[PDB]
Amino acid sequence: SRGSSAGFDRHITIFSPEGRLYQVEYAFKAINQGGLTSVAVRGKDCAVIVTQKKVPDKLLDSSTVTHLFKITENIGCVMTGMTADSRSQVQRARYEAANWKYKYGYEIPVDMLCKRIADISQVYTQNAEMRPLGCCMILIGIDEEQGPQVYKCDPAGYYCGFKATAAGVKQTESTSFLEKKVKKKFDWTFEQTVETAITCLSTVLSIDFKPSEIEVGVVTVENPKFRILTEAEIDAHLVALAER
């Protein structure tokens, strides 16, 4: 023990002598290969997802570079990590939701959709012949009783609902920033939710964004349909922040 290894325990998902799954651990490192960080925050009225948008190449059609995805009309997501893996997972999520509605006659709850994707990821941690997906999914939606929801699932098949969370390169620093900010807040709950998200991202990256360098997605209690902010909309938040 302390980093020990036997047999094929670094190549396939079998247990190491401490009871670790190295291949799963390595899938978490794959999430950072992309170089990106995402933040998600929930208040009483809305839930928001913010991620970096990096378009290094001028020759890209930047309208096709996104990590924000509509899963259903009412469920949005931000993907962090290996892009093709992410897209696959988005497709599976879309399929699971559509299937749920066909079978059960009501929209899949965000928590259930997150659980389902996490359960599918679990299988890759126990069966030897395929790798985990090197990506992480953050879901937002409005639940009719519990309000705005933020859920995250990961390549180990863990999942959880959150007040706020993050993913990718600056996840730890985002988590620190968000913790420090909720403790301050009465009944431990975020109120300025889009500002917290952008501010968190800007602090941990040290950037001060242009409106073309982030993407923002939202769901609200008054407007549950998932919506992607335009550049001008995002600019209005950037300018409102810059002015105090």
Binding site: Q33, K58, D61, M130
Partner: protein
């Protein structure tokens, strides 16, 4: 070693088999696509490895639907197989939904197929990158590129293969948003001649195709007379 299977991550979170497949594309000669005002133009530096081969042998430009061209780099047998997958996907879409597959959806579907070959010891990743181009009045000009990992993005201009960077830097000089397909073909040819290493690889054929307002949204080979004029312009421009 951590680089033998697409179902094994390295300790840093890489999938080396996918990276190795990318190296096969990167050893290949260069293909480019450019989207412009009224369509998309493709060009390939098609190395001729024997004089015994016919003109046109080992095409790297394919029709995958009547409105969709495909331009490839990498292992050619893998690319052709992907062209068959693309064809089947476009065909099935028409049968099921009753209209021509939108470019983006076709790109996303074939990309997921490519992606499926990056998860498993049972199969290997495709050793090819490919561009898809189309044009319609409703959707305009669209150019997508898909790599061995299964990532898919849209482009104004794109290049794949061994002189990729040199090609991109030449493509960046064009104001392609304001140019027509007829103007762009010449510039495609020009750029293939620029990035071609006449010392290291001796003989090539220029392959050109396009889809745009001028072909009524059909992907077609550039006519012979227009290709020859574009070559002559590229060659004289090299001077």
């Amino acid at each position: 070693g951590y680089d033998l299977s697409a179902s094994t991550f390295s300790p840093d979170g890489r999938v080396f088999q996918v990276e190795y497949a990318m190296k096969a594309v990167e050893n290949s000669s260069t293909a480019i696509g450019i989207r412009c005002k009224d369509g998309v133009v493709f060009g390939v530096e098609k190395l001729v490895l024997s004089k015994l081969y016919e003109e046109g042998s080992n095409k790297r430009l394919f029709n995958v639907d009547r409105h969709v061209g495909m331009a490839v780099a990498g292992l050619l047998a893998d690319a052709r197989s992907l062209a068959d997958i693309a064809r089947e996907e476009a065909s099935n879409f028409r049968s099921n939904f009753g209209y021509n597959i939108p470019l983006k959806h076709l790109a996303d579907r074939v990309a997921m197929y490519v992606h499926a070959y990056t998860l498993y010891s049972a199969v290997r990743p495709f050793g090819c990158s490919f561009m898809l181009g189309s044009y319609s009045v409703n959707d305009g000009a669209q150019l997508y590129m898909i790599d061995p990992s299964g990532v898919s993005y849209g482009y104004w201009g794109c290049a794949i293969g061994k002189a990729r960077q040199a090609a991109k830097t030449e493509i960046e000089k064009l104001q392609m948003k304001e140019m027509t397909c007829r103007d762009i073909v010449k510039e495609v040819a020009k750029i293939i001649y620029i990035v071609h290493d006449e010392v290291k690889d001796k003989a090539f054929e220029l392959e050109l195709s396009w889809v745009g307002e001028l072909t009524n949204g059909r992907h077609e080979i550039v006519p012979k007379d227009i290709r020859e004029e574009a070559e002559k312009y590229a060659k004289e421009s090299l001077k």
